[PDB]
From a paper:
Here, we describe and detail the use of sub-particle CryoEM averaging and present updated reconstructions of DARP14, a multi-subunit tetrahedrally symmetric protein complex. Originally described by Liu and Gonen et al. (2018), DARP14 was computationally designed as a scaffold capable of displaying small proteins for CryoEM. DARPins are small, ~17 kDa helical repeat proteins that feature variable residue loops capable of selective non-covalent binding to other proteins, akin to antibodies. Variants of DARP14 and similar scaffolds have since been generated and used to bind and image small proteins, such as GFP and KRAS.
For the DARPin signal, we turned to sub-particle reconstruction coupled with signal subtraction. Therefore, for both the trimeric and subsequent monomeric reconstructions, extended parts of the core cage were kept intact to allow for sufficient signal to remain for classifications and local refinement. Stemming from the previous trimeric particle dataset, further subtraction and sub-particle reconstructions were made whereby each monomeric subunit was isolated. Using the same methodology as in the preceding run, the coordinates were shifted from the trimers to the center of each of the three monomers and combined, tripling the dataset. Since the monomers lack symmetry, our final reconstructions were therefore made using no applied (C1) symmetry. In contrast to the full complex, the resulting trimeric and monomeric DARPin maps feature vastly improved high-resolution information, particularly for the helical extension linker and residues close to the cage, facilitating model building and demonstrating the effectiveness of reducing the effect of high symmetry on averaging. The resolution range for both C3 and C1 was comparable; however, C3 DARPin information looked clearer closer to the core cage, while C1 DARPin looked clearer further away from the core cage. All DARPin proteins displayed on the scaffold contain a single anchoring point, the extended helical linker. Several residues can be found in close proximity to the core cage, potentially allowing for non-covalent interactions and/or covalent disulfide bridges.
Author numbering: 23 to 316
């Protein structure tokens, strides 16, 4: 009869329907999680419909939700605001999160009007946090599969995932972007297809290696020149102060050296140890490289 109670019940039932539509895009594990969440939401709906006469959820449910919160929190690294909807699954889950927030406001209003349902409000808040975490986890999983595809180097998974909205500039715990892996393995086509959609050529790993430094380290002319036409920093310095030309001279790639020189590389740059690329060439006894470097 009371309008707030009916509105809260309707909003919760909408929330459980949205959970139902979302639960068809996840694996078995999140599917089971969402099913027991449906069970708890139905319990809350039954409790509210009786004005607290029928016993509802128990504190074990909230403890379980907090356990899940911690479990998915250890596996996520939130650093800045992210645009919702990285992939279909994340978008569905975040929509469910917003509906959960609406139902949470409804339950809070009902509690303020009647003094019951505080545990339901806490459960819904935990549900909102859990859905946000699940969306971020799905995004991270897609990024990890993208990294796996880049390491494999055969581009079908790369393109299907990139079209699917997987984060292009996601990084491993080492800090390597898919561009870094593509440069390391030696599959350029992935490098171009990633660079087309705004891939940052100047990404920095935890080891100081940019994609261009490591790519030139492997002696891959094609990938390096593709990076250069895409605005690669010809004189970017690593964690040891090395420019691309220093590492180019380290393995004696004359063609890489001359390409870098054509694009503004500094022959006499200083690293942390003070070594210059020309002096590096002199040290190893290669004379044609020094002649080109001079």
């Amino acid at each position: 009869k009371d309008s707030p109670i009916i509105e809260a019940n309707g909003t919760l039932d909408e929330l459980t329907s949205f959970i139902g539509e979302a639960k068809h895009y996840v694996d078995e594990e999140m599917k089971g999680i969402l099913e027991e969440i449906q069970n708890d939401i139905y319990k809350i709906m039954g409790e509210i419909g009786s004005k607290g006469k029928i016993e509802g959820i128990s504190e074990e449910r909230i403890a379980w939700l907090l356990k899940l919160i911690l479990r998915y929190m250890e596996m996520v690294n939130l650093k800045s605001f992210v645009l919702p909807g990285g992939t279909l699954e994340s978008a569905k889950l975040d929509v469910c999160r917003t509906i959960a927030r609406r139902a949470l406001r409804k339950v809070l209003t009902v509690t303020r009007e009647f003094g019951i349902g505080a545990e339901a409000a806490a459960y819904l808040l935990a549900l909102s946090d859990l859905l946000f975490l699940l969306a971020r986890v799905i995004e991270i999983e897609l990024g990890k599969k993208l990294l796996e595809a880049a390491r494999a180097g055969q581009d079908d998974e790369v393109r299907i995932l990139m079209a699917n909205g997987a984060d292009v500039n996601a990084h491993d715990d080492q800090g390597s972007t898919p561009l870094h892996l593509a440069a390391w393995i030696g599959h350029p086509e992935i490098v171009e297809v990633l660079l087309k959609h705004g891939a940052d050529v100047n990404a920095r790993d935890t080891d100081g290696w940019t994609p261009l430094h490591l790519a030139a380290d492997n002696g891959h002319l094609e990938i390096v020149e593709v990076l250069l036409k895409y605005g690669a920093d010809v004189n970017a310095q690593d964690a040891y102060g090395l420019t691309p030309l220093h590492l180019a001279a380290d393995r004696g790639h004359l063609e890489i050296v001359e390409v870098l020189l054509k694009h503004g590389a500094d022959v006499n740059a200083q690293d942390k140890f003070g070594k210059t690329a020309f002096d590096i060439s002199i040290d190893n006894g290669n004379e044609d490289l020094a002649e080109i470097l001079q």
